[PDB]
Design a protein around this ligand. Structure first.
Ligand SMILES: *CC(=O)N1CC2(C1)CN(S(=O)(=O)c1ccc(I)cc1)CCO2
Ligand SMILES: *CC(=O)N1CC2(C1)CN(S(=O)(=O)c1ccc(I)cc1)CCO2
Ligand SMILES: [Cl-]
Ligand SMILES: [Cl-]
Ligand SMILES: [Mg+2]
Ligand SMILES: [Mg+2]
Ligand SMILES: [Mg+2]
Ligand SMILES: [Mg+2]
Ligand SMILES: [Mg+2]
Lengths: 231, 9, 231, 9
């Protein structure tokens, strides 16, 4: 790879530079290169990896939604809208395949603290979920099962190893509930998981850490918005 | 649309 | 080119979709493919070309400025900032060279209406100016001479063939004045040109066309803003 | 401040 000759420390340093420059494609390439050195990522470095690929794929998802919406209205003009939509779809799938391959090849493992292991399995579920949003057919059913399995395995870890207010546990629970509702056509499972997560966090508020209180509350805020939307 | 965890920090 | 097999009309259609999806790199590629068919661009298509490359290069310039600022503030560390700045710089120069090549190879010509000829020559001056922002040494002197000649040639046409309120004439004069002030270290030339441009527009403002009032007055306000900044 | 150039119309 183009990053194979660069020192790990320099890849992290340039990733932070690319984040300040809002150069998210660059930031992702640098962190992929750092992951491929084969050493573990710290929490701060995991955040760099997450921010980088979420910005890239998030932009493709938004674009795909705009294009898909325009495509729907020729059921209300040539192949160009479909062609261009398929092009963005293919790029989105390539980036998701890239994140999943890194997760499988380098990041998911038995070692590390629960935050790391829960973070990587959560991320695996998210990127299968993003693939599911655009998949169409026998491919899609497999993708949905893969997202579910990743989320559940992450969920088991977080419940055994983390307090109910841990921001990573909450964010995992939030996204899993989104998966149930938007992807797996399981609204009841979504409300129940969202409610139980919110409730058990509220009953165990003493486990909050000042360095992560703001993060925890934002996810709880979002669980409540989601329940308000879903009920 | 439902809300997922945001791209924070 | 990657777009050589696609019909011109489909390239224009996809450029418009890419704008709706905020996929400006795609938009520029589509418009480059349209240009390379060798047919003339309409006013509307020229705006698509201009919007696509300004967004691409605009993001690179902002990034280059962020990184250059950090680089200078590391002179009051390792080579990583310079390397990453040089990487973004090299990409910026590539996009400018691409625009200058399209202008030289396909768009600038002796035929055509005043809007088209002035617009392309202004663009040539603008993209030599963006190269000048990151150039050093004897390279920078050559680039600055090229921007100036392009701008002057545009000015000569605009003064003979366009009214003083024409937004393309105004936007050219504004950018030429920025060139004088920020690039060629000629503050007096800049101040004089902005003043004359504002005055001659203000003296004809009553003749304004509904299709052009907004653009004209905004450029006029920018001229005045710069004069407040420079005096 | 940087001088302002023509914006994206
Ligand atoms: C410490 C660690 O491993 N981190 C990775 C993280 C910090 C958290 N993730 S996340 O997807 O779990 C998340 C939690 C809270 C919020 I508000 C948003 C996202 C994202 C990367 O940073
Ligand atoms: C009709 C035509 O050729 N057009 C190109 C343009 C419309 C105008 N240019 S510009 O760079 O001359 C410009 C004019 C006014 C403003 I406010 C901004 C920029 C940009 C592309 O669209
Ligand atoms: Cl396409
Ligand atoms: Cl670099
Ligand atoms: Mg080493
Ligand atoms: Mg596809
Ligand atoms: Mg044709
Ligand atoms: Mg020091
Ligand atoms: Mg260099």
């Amino acid at each position: 790879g183009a990053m194979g000759s660069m020192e790990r420390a320099s890849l992290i340093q340039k990733a932070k530079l690319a984040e300040q420059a809002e150069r998210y494609e660059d930031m992702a390439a640098f962190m992929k290169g750092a992951v491929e050195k084969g050493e573990e990522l710290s929490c701060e470095e995991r955040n760099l990896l997450s921010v980088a690929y979420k910005n890239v794929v998030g932009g493709q998802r938004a674009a795909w939604r705009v294009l898909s919406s325009i495509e729907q209205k020729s059921n209300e003009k040539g192949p160009e809208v479909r062609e261009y939509r398929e092009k963005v779809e293919t790029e989105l799938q390539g980036v998701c395949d890239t994140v999943l391959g890194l997760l499988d090849s380098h990041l998911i493992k038995e070692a590390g603290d629960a935050e790391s292991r829960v973070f990587y399995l959560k991320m695996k579920g998210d990127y299968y979920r993003y693939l599911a949003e655009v998949a169409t057919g026998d491919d899609k059913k497999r993708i949905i099962d893969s997202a579910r399995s990743a989320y559940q395995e992450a969920m088991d870890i977080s419940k055994k190893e983390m307090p109910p207010t841990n921001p990573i546990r909450l964010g995992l629970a939030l996204n899993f509930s989104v998966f149930h509702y938007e992807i797996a056509n399981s609204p009841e499972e979504a409300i129940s998981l969202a409610k139980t997560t919110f409730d058990e966090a509220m009953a165990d508020l003493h486990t909050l850490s000042e360095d992560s209180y703001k993060d925890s509350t934002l996810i709880m805020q979002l669980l409540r918005d989601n329940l308000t939307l879903w009920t | 649309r439902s809300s997922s965890a945001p791209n924070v920090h």
